[PDB]
Amino acid sequence: MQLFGGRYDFEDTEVRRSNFDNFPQALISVFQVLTGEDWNSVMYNGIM
C-alpha cells in the first residue's frame, strides 16, 4: 500500500484488478503473489 497505493494511474483502458489501492485489495494481491499465480504481472504493473 505504501509503495504502490495510488500509483496505478495509467492513462490506458487496461484493467488491473490486482493492485494496492486499499487494505483488502492489497491483502488479496499479497495472497495471490504468495500462491505464485500471475505474480509476474503484478511485478510488471509495479515496475510500470
Binding site: G6, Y8, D9, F10, E11, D12, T13, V15, D21, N22
Partner: protein
C-alpha cells in the same frame, strides 16, 4: 543615371504604342458604335435597388412560410398519433413493417429479424436529390450501437409509421420540397423520401457515427440557448484513466454547443482557475471551441480537491453580466469522480433561488463515494450521469438537453416557434442547407391530466431542409452586372447568402496530422461543424461595412453609397470601386437581405427582338460549322430552361443549345425568353463586330488573339487556334478580367499565371482588356469587355528598340498594379513572366512599398485546402496579400541602399493603363538581399482568438427563451 526627361519620353512613347495597339486592334469604338447604331432592337430598363430587395425578401419569407406550414402539420399529426399509442410488448405476432436504411439492397439478404419486417424499394433516380429516392414510403436510420428490435425502438416504429401520409401530402402540395425528417428522442430518424444511407454500417470497411440527437437542428429545437460553465476536477485522484475520459467527455460536450450558447471551462484543485486565455464566457463558435478543446487536452492531475472554491469560481463567472451572454440557461456542468463534500453553504449563498442548474458527471471506474455529487445534481434542479468508458461518453454528454427542455414543454403552444439553423453540409450529400425545426410534445392523458410523469420530455424534433440553391433561385443576378450581388446575414454576422461562401468546411488554425499513429482500418470521424462564415470575413473589411452590418443585424432597412476596396476573383488584385448597399429585413424571420450594386449597373438591357429572321440569323451566327468565319464561340451555361442542362463541357452544351433553339421556335412557351433574347442580341452584335472589323485585318503583327466577352454569355475569340488557348470560364460573371475591366476606367493588364501546367507565357500572350461604355439617352452602360493577347516577342522588340538585352548596367522592368512582372530586360527574368516582382527582386519591391507607391492589405481565407503538416488535404485558414496603387503621383525617383551600397531607381506610371516602368541600377552591382517578399496563399492560424473576445463583434441573441417553470417536477437525477 539617365535624366528624368529621357525616361519620361521613353515611357510616353511606350504607352502610346501600347494604347494605340490595344485600341486599334480590339475595336472599342466600333463596338460602342454598333451598340449605339441600332438602339431599337433593345430597351434600357432601370434596376430599382429598393424594390428588388423587397421582392427578394418577400420571396424568401414566403418560401420559409411554405416550409413552416409543412412543419406544424407534421408536429400536430405526430402528437395526435403518439397520443393514441398502446405500448405493447408483443411484436412477434404483429410484425412492424418498415424500410431500414443502410442495409444491403440485395434481394437475397432475408434478414427476418424478430418482430420486424423489411421493405425493398424501387429507388428511381430523381432530380433535386443527387441520389436515388423512393416516394412510396419513408426511410428509417437507427444508430449502429442502438439495437433495432428492442421494445423502445419497435414501439416508436409503428406510431411513427403514420407520418408517411403527411410526408406524402407535404410532398404533393409542394413538389420542390426537400428532406422531411423526424428525429426521435430514442435515436431514430424517419425521413422522406426514402433513400439508402450515405455510409452503411459495416458492409464495407467504413462505418458511420450518426446520432440524430447530436445534430445542430435537433439540438437547437430541443432546448433554448445556454450559458454553460464546464467545471473540471484536476485534483490528484482523477489521475489515470478518468482524466483521459474527462478530456474526451469535455470535448464531446463542447461539440454539442452552437453559436447561440456561451461557454467557459474552469478547473479546480484546491484552487480554481481558467483553462485558457478567456477568463469569461465566450460565444462558443468554431474558433473558441477549438481553443477550449486545445486547452482541455493539456491539463494534468495534481493537488487536493476543493469543491467550495471551484463552485464559487463558477458562480462568479456566471454572475458577470459585463460581457455578451445568452442570459437564458445558467448551468454548471461538473466533471469529477467522487468526493465527500457537498458544499451546502456555497449553494445556499450563491444558488438560493435555484436559478442555476447543476449537472454532475462521475467519470471512470473508482471506489470514491458518489452520493455527494448526486445530491449536488438533484438539489440544484440538475441531473446526475455516469461515464465509465469511452463508449458511454457520446450518449451521456447529450442527455442534459432532456432536462433543459422541461420549461419549453411546460410553456405549451407558446414554445412551438419555427427556428432555422446556420448553414451546414447535408449528411445525405445534398450541399449547403438550412433546416427549420419544431419540437414535438408528448401529450398522453392531456385532456385528463393523469400521469404528467414522462410528458415533460419531448418526443423529438421535426425538420425540413432548405437548400441554398433554392434561396439563390429567388435572387436572380443576370439583370445586374457581374459586380453586383445579393447577400443575406443572420442576427449573428454569419452569411446565409454570399458569392464567397463555399461548400468547404470552415478551417481552424494550422492542420497538423500524425500519420505515424493512424491505422489503415480505424474509420476516424470526419466532421460535424457548420459553415459559419462571418460577413466581415467574406469581403474586405472597412469601417463603413462594420456599421452597415450592425445596422442590418438589428432589423433596419436603408441604403448607403460609398467607395470601397474590392478583391478580384483571383486573389491577386484590389480595385477601388463605387458601391451601393441596399438592405432590408425579412419580415417573417431574423435574416436581413442586402443588394450590392455599382454605380454603372443601375440600368440593364432588355432585348426587343420579336420578328423571325433577325432571331434566326442571330441564332445561326453561333454554330461550330462556321466558327472559322466568326471565331471560337463560348456560351455561358445558364438556366435558360429546364429542358437543357448545364454540362461543364462548352462544345456539347453549345450543341444542345443550338439544337434546342432550332427544334422549337424562340416563342419559348416554358423557357426564359429574356435570357435567350439577350443571348441572341449579344451574338448578333458580336458577330457584326467580328465580321465588319476583325475580319478586315486577317492577321496583324503584334497581337495573338482578339476576344470579346459580353454581358449575356457570349465569348468570341477571333483565331480558332487561339480558342484552345482560352482557359477562361465560359460564364461571363465568373471572369476576373471582366470585373476588373468593369471597375477600372482604363486598359487593364492581366499577368499570366507562372510555373503552371499549360501554355500561358508565350503561346498565349499578355492579356489586355477594356470595358465598353455606351450612352443611349445619357445613361451609362457597360455591356461588353474586349481584349487582346499581345505577343511577347513583338513586345520585346518594342522594348529593346541603356535598356538593352542582358545588360549588366541597368535593370528595366514593367509591372502591373499588383507587382507582377510582365517584361524585364535581361531575358533571364523574362523567362519568369507573371511571377511576383518581390520574389525575384525583393529589395526593390520592399523599398517601393516603403515609399508608398505600392499599398497592400492582407485578408484571411477561412475555407482553404491545406497540405497537413508534421507534429491528403484538409481544411484550414490562409493569409492572402494583395498589392495595388495608392498614391496618385506619376514619377518616383530615388536610390535604394543596402549597407555601404546604393542603387538609383526611377519608376513611372504609364498613362491610361495600370502599368509601371522601373529602371534601376543592376542587382549584381552590389550583393544585397535580405528575404523574399512572397505574395501567395500562406497557410496561417490567426487572428488571435482570445484577443477578439475582449472586444467582439456586434450580436443579437434570441428574443424569447424558456427557463425556470414552477410546474417542473425535477425529482429525477
Amino acid at each position: 543615371f539617365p535624366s528624368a526627361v529621357t525616361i519620361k519620353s521613353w515611357v510616353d512613347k511606350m504607352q502610346e504604342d501600347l494604347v494605340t495597339l490595344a485600341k486599334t486592334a480590339s475595336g472599342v469604338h466600333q463596338l460602342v458604335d454598333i451598340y449605339e447604331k441600332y438602339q431599337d432592337l433593345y430597351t434600357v430598363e432601370p434596376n430599382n435597388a429598393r424594390q428588388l430587395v423587397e421582392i427578394a425578401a418577400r420571396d424568401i419569407e414566403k418560401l420559409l412560410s411554405n416550409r413552416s406550414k409543412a412543419l406544424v402539420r407534421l408536429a400536430l399529426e405526430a402528437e395526435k398519433v403518439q397520443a393514441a399509442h398502446q405500448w405493447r410488448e408483443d411484436f412477434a405476432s404483429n410484425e412492424v413493417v418498415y424500410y431500414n436504411a443502410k442495409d444491403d439492397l440485395d434481394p437475397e439478404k432475408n434478414d427476418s429479424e424478430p418482430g420486424s419486417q423489411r421493405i425493398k424499394p424501387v429507388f428511381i433516380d430523381d432530380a433535386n436529390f443527387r441520389r436515388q429516392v423512393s416516394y412510396q414510403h419513408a426511410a428509417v436510420h437507427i444508430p449502429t450501437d442502438i439495437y433495432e428490435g428492442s421494445t423502445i425502438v419497435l414501439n416508436e416504429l409503428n406510431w411513427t409509421s403514420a407520418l408517411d401520409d403527411v410526408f406524402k401530402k407535404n410532398r404533393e402540395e409542394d413538389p420542390s420540397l426537400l428532406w422531411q425528417v423526424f428525429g426521435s428522442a430514442t435515436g431514430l430518424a424517419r425521413y422522406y423520401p426514402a433513400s439508402p444511407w450515405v455510409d452503411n454500417s459495416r458492409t464495407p470497411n467504413k462505418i458511420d457515427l450518426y446520432d440524430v440527437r447530436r445534430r445542430p437542428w435537433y439540438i437547437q429545437g430541443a432546448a433554448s440557448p445556454k450559458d454553460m460553465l464546464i467545471l473540471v476536477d484536476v485534483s490528484g485522484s482523477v489521475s489515470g484513466l478518468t482524466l483521459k475520459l474527462i478530456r474526451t467527455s469535455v470535448s464531446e460536450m463542447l461539440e454539442t454547443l452552437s453559436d447561440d450558447d456561451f461557454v467557459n471551462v474552469a478547473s479546480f484543485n484546491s484552487n480554481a482557475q481558467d483553462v485558457s486565455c478567456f477568463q469569461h464566457l465566450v460565444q462558443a463558435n468554431v474558433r473558441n471551441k477549438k481553443v477550449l478543446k486545445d486547452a482541455v487536452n493539456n491539463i494534468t492531475a495534481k493537488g487536493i480537491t476543493d469543491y467550495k472554491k471551484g463552485f464559487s469560481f463558477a458562480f462568479e463567472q456566471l454572475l458577470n453580466y459585463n460581457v455578451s451572454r445568452a442570459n437564458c440557461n445558467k448551468i454548471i456542468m461538473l466533471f469529477t469522480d467522487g468526493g465527500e463534500e457537498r458544499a451546502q453553504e456555497i449553494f445556499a449563498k450563491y444558488n438560493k433561488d435555484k436559478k442555476v442548474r447543476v449537472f454532475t458527471f462521475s467519470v471512470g471506474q473508482h471506489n470514491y463515494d458518489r452520493g455527494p455529487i448526486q445530491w449536488m445534481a438533484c438539489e440544484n434542479k440538475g441531473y446526475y450521469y455516469e461515464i465509465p468508458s469511452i463508449g458511454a461518453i457520446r450518449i451521456n454528454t447529450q442527455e442534459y438537453l432532456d432536462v433543459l427542455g422541461r420549461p419549453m414543454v411546460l410553456a405549451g403552444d407558446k414554445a412551438k416557434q419555427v427556428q432555422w439553423t446556420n448553414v451546414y453540409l447535408d449528411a445525405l450529400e445534398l450541399g449547403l442547407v438550412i433546416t427549420g425545426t419544431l419540437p414535438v410534445f408528448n401529450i398522453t392523458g392531456q385532456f385528463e391530466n393523469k400521469t404528467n410523469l414522462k410528458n415533460q420530455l419531448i418526443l423529438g424534433v421535426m425538420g425540413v431542409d432548405v437548400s441554398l440553391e433554392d434561396i439563390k433561385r429567388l435572387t436572380p443576378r443576370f439583370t445586374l452586372c457581374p459586380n453586383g450581388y445579393y447577400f443575406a446575414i443572420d442576427p449573428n454576422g454569419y452569411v446565409l447568402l454570399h458569392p464567397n461562401l463555399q461548400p468547404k468546411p470552415i478551417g481552424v488554425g494550422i492542420p497538423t496530422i500524425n500519420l505515424r499513429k493512424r491505422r489503415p482500418n480505424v474509420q476516424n470521424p470526419k466532421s460535424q461543424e457548420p459553415v459559419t462564415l462571418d460577413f466581415l470575413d467574406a469581403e474586405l473589411e472597412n469601417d463603413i461595412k462594420v456599421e452597415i452590418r450592425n445596422k442590418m443585424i438589428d432589423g433596419e432597412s436603408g441604403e448607403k453609397t460609398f467607395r470601397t476596396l474590392v478583391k478580384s476573383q483571383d486573389e491577386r488584385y484590389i480595385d477601388k470601386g463605387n458601391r451601393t448597399y441596399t438592405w432590408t429585413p425579412v419580415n417573417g424571420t431574423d435574416y436581413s437581405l442586402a443588394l450590392v450594386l455599382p454605380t454603372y449597373s443601375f440600368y440593364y438591357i432588355k432585348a426587343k427582338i420579336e420578328e423571325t429572321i433577325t432571331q434566326a440569323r442571330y441564332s445561326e451566327t453561333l454554330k461550330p460549322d462556321n466558327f472559322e468565319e466568326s471565331g471560337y464561340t463560348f456560351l455561358a451555361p445558364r438556366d435558360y430552361c429546364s429542358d437543357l442542362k448545364p454540362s461543364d463541357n462548352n462544345t456539347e452544351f453549345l450543341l444542345n443549345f443550338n439544337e434546342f433553339i432550332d427544334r422549337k421556335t424562340p416563342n419559348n412557351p416554358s423557357c426564359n425568353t429574356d435570357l435567350i433574347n439577350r443571348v441572341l442580341l449579344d451574338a448578333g452584335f458580336t458577330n457584326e463586330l467580328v465580321q465588319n472589323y476583325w475580319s478586315k485585318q486577317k492577321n496583324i503583327k503584334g497581337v495573338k488573339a482578339r476576344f470579346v466577352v459580353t454581358d449575356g454569355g457570349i465569348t468570341r475569340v477571333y483565331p480558332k487556334e487561339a480558342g484552345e488557348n482560352w482557359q477562361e470560364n465560359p460564364e461571363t460573371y465568373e471572369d476576373s478580367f471582366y470585373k476588373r475591366s468593369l471597375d477600372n476606367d482604363n486598359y487593364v493588364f492581366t499577368a499570366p499565371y507562372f510555373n503552371k501546367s499549360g501554355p500561358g507565357a508565350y503561346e498565349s500572350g499578355i492579356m489586355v482588356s477594356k470595358a465598353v461604355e455606351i450612352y443611349i439617352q445619357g445613361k451609362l452602360l457597360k455591356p461588353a469587355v474586349v481584349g487582346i493577347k499581345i505577343d511577347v516577342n513583338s513586345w520585346i522588340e518594342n522594348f529593346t528598340k541603356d535598356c538593352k538585352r542582358n545588360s549588366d548596367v541597368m535593370d528595366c522592368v514593367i509591372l502591373d498594379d499588383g507587382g507582377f512582372l510582365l517584361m524585364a530586360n535581361h531575358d533571364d527574368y523574362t523567362n519568369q513572366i507573371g511571377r511576383f516582382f518581390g520574389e525575384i527582386d525583393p529589395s526593390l519591391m520592399r523599398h517601393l512599398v516603403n515609399i508608398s507607391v505600392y499599398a497592400f492589405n492582407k485578408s484571411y481565407d477561412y475555407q482553404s485546402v491545406c497540405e497537413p503538416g508534421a507534429a491528403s488535404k484538409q481544411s484550414c485558414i490562409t493569409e492572402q496579400t494583395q498589392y495595388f496603387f495608392d498614391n496618385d503621383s506619376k514619377s518616383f525617383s530615388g536610390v535604394l541602399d543596402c549597407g555601404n551600397c546604393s542603387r538609383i531607381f526611377h519608376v513611372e506610371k504609364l498613362m491610361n493603363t495600370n502599368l509601371i516602368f522601373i529602371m534601376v541600377e543592376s542587382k549584381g552591382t552590389c550583393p544585397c538581399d535580405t528575404r523574399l517578399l512572397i505574395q501567395a496563399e500562406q497557410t496561417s492560424d490567426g487572428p488571435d482568438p482570445c484577443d477578439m473576445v475582449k472586444q467582439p463583434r456586434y450580436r443579437k441573441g434570441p428574443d424569447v427563451c424558456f427557463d425556470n417553470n414552477v410546474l417542473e417536477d425535477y425529482t429525477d437525477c
